[PDB]
């Protein structure tokens, strides 16, 4: 018979998973997928609260290590990478000058969103955090940061390179140097309390196979280092 498993993936994987799901369910007619997308840190809190999730897809090695240490997750596996960029709504201005003219700079919540955590490490390592400290607006996930800059409600925003590629309404004004922050790597894990570990193991391994790896490449994502 059919079996439904629920995966909690990061918000930055919303559009690439849209194409992975039909290819997986075709190759596995007995496993059906249910996805919820949001900030990885908030996905971490729900697993730590007893949420009935089978597997998770997180954009932070820190959030994955946290679930492993509490024996809430198991079998971690990096499957993708990404880069951080500064986007503005649609002059040879530098990053500091872009943040000077900006009145609202949208970043993910550094306490529950990796994209906001990577963006904070960039500003700290550039000696720019305290300068733009009072102008930051925290969001629920990186896709919310994209929605604010798209609508013009925010002057600048920090999103992933894959997020800016999917938007005609914004444009990249600065590519954050990858050394200015911890490596952006996506990880897959299995919630230990899941009753469907066999079925969830099929999908989590499917992400590291050739079919899912090419979807990430064509969507701008990077590979596991």
97 vs 171, beta carbon nearer Ca ion? 97
CA 206 centroid distance within chain:
19
Q: Which stretch binds Ca ion (CB under 5 A): 8-16, 35-43, 130-138, 216-224?
A: 130-138
- Nearest-approach distance from CB 75 to Ca ion, in angstroms: 16
Among 15, 19, 193, 205, interactor with Ca ion by CB under 5 A: 193
Query: From residue 134 to residue 153, what is the string marking binding to Ca ion with x (rule CB under 5 A)?
Result: x-------------------
- Nearest-approach distance from CB 98 to Ca ion, in angstroms: 12
- What whole-number distance in Å separates Cα of residue 5 and Cα of residue 183? 29
Decide if 76 contacts 191 (C-beta within 8 A): no
- Nearest-approach distance from CB 34 to Ca ion, in angstroms: 16
| CB-neighbour burial class of residue 135 (10 A; exposed 0-12, middle 13-18, buried 19+) | middle
Which has the closest alpha carbon to 156: 180, 139, 140?
A: 139
Decide if 38 contacts 141 (C-beta within 8 A): yes
65 vs 193, beta carbon nearer Ca ion? 193
Decide if 52 contacts 163 (C-beta within 8 A): no
52 vs 152, beta carbon nearer Ca ion? 52
Q: Is 100 annotated as a binding residue?
A: yes
Q: Which stretch binds Ca ion (CB under 5 A): 3-11, 46-54, 72-80, 126-134?
A: 126-134
Radius of gyration of the chain (CA): 18
Which has the closest alpha carbon to 217: 61, 49, 3, 20?
A: 20
Q: Is 40 annotated as a binding residue?
A: yes
3-state secondary structure of 57: strand
Q: Which stretch binds Ca ion (CB under 5 A): 42-50, 132-140, 180-188, 211-219?
A: 132-140
Decide if 173 contacts 87 (C-beta within 8 A): yes
Q: Is 19 annotated as a binding residue?
A: no
Tokens 């971490």 — which residue?
44
1 touches Ca ion (CB under 5 A)? no
- Nearest-approach distance from CB 136 to Ca ion, in angstroms: 8
- Nearest-approach distance from CB 222 to Ca ion, in angstroms: 30
Total site size for Ca ion, rule CB under 5 A: 3
Would you list which residues are annotated within the binding site? 12, 40, 71, 96, 100, 115, 134, 142, 160, 193, 195
Q: What is the contact surface with Ca ion in residues (CB under 5 A)?
A: 134, 193, 195
């Amino acid at each position: 018979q059919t079996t439904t498993i629920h995966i909690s993936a990061a918000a930055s994987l919303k559009d690439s998973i849209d194409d992975v799901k039909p290819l997986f369910e075709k190759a596995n007619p007995t496993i059906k997928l249910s996805f919820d997308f949001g900030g990885s840190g908030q996905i971490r809190e729900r697993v730590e609260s007893g949420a009935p999730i089978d597997g998770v897809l997180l954009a932070s090695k820190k959030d994955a290590d946290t679930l492993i240490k509490q024996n809430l997750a198991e079998k971690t596996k990096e499957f993708a990478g990404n880069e951080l960029v500064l986007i503005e709504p649609k002059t040879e201005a530098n990053l500091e000058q872009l943040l000077n003219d900006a009145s609202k700079i949208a970043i993910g919540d550094p306490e529950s969103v990796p994209a906001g955590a990577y963006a904070k490490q960039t500003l700290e390592n550039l000696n720019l955090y305290n300068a733009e400290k009072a102008k930051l607006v925290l969001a629920t996930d990186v896709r919310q940061v994209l929605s604010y800059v798209e609508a013009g409600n925010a002057d600048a925003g920090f999103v992933y390179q894959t997020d800016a590629l999917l938007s005609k309404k914004v444009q990249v004004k600065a590519k954050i140097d990858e050394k200015l922050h911890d490596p952006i790597a996506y990880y897959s894990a299995q919630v230990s309390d899941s009753d469907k570990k066999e079925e969830t193991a099929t999908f989590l391994d499917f992400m590291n196979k050739s079919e899912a790896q090419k979807i990430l490449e064509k969507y701008g994502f990077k590979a596991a280092n």
